[PDB]
């Protein structure tokens, strides 16, 4: 099954991450409601997660897709935020658990801003927040997100809503640009779970202004 590495923090490798993480941090329309107020990150611990099998998975289909984009995968390193990231670090993406109520339809929504995962790191909205004090904005808990290698191929760009249970025809993903009467940051949308790969698990807290 899968195994965590863990990365110290004087690696090279964690720092990338890390700050890869913080630098994307954005102010959010929603006040900060579905994931907090923060303007930094308290990094707990940054893990490389390994799967033969998962991993595998993964690299037969980016084979697949760079054949049919003219040897272009297009991948991206970007975060995803969920409730479920216990069952994606052990058993991978899977577009049988896309986010229905995505404005792209149903596949697997990334971003490219750390914080915008973060609103879904206690669900949709954020949810309740936190278990322990159903707080959107605790300070106390650690939190958990992906830093993930994701397969975009052919992306079919789209400055709102489109929905739709699949790919469009001839491409691999959709983005969601964003645009001065539209989306904020952009989002990133796969409709076939062996499209990303869960490359990091970070462990954090959100920091109190
Ligand atoms: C079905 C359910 C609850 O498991 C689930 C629902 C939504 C997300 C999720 N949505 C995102 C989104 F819409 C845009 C974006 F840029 C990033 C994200 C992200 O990181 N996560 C993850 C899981
Ligand atoms: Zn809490």
């Given at each position: 099954?899968?195994?965590?590495?863990?990365?110290?923090?004087?690696?090279?490798?964690?720092?990338?991450?890390?700050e890869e993480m913080q630098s994307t941090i954005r102010e959010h329309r929603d006040?900060?409601?579905?994931?907090?107020i923060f303007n930094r990150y308290n990094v707990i611990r940054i893990q490389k997660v390994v799967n033969k099998?998962?991993?595998?998975?993964?690299?037969?289909?980016?084979?697949?897709?760079?054949?049919?984009?003219?040897?272009?995968?297009?991948?991206?390193?970007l975060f995803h935020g969920s409730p479920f990231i216990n069952a994606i670090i052990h058993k991978g993406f899977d577009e049988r658990h896309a986010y229905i109520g995505g404005?792209?339809?149903?596949g697997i929504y990334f971003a490219e801003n750390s914080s915008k995962s973060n609103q879904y790191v206690y669900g949709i909205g954020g949810g309740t927040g936190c278990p322990t004090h159903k707080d959107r904005?605790?300070?106390?808990?650690h939190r958990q997100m992906?830093?993930?290698?994701?397969?975009?191929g052919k992306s079919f760009l789209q400055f709102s809503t489109m929905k739709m249970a699949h790919a469009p025809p001839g491409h691999h993903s959709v983005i969601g640009r964003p645009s001065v009467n539209g989306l904020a940051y952009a989002e990133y949308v796969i409709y076939r779970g062996?499209?990303?790969?869960?490359?990091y698990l970070i462990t954090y807290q959100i920091m109190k202004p």
């Open positions: 099954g899968t195994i965590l590495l863990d990365l110290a923090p004087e690696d090279k490798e964690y720092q990338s991450v890390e006040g900060g409601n579905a994931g907090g099998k998962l991993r595998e998975r993964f690299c037969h289909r980016q084979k697949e897709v760079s054949e049919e984009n003219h040897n272009h995968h297009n991948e991206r390193m404005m792209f339809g149903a904005s605790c300070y106390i808990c992906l830093f993930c290698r994701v397969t975009l062996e499209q990303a790969y869960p490359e």
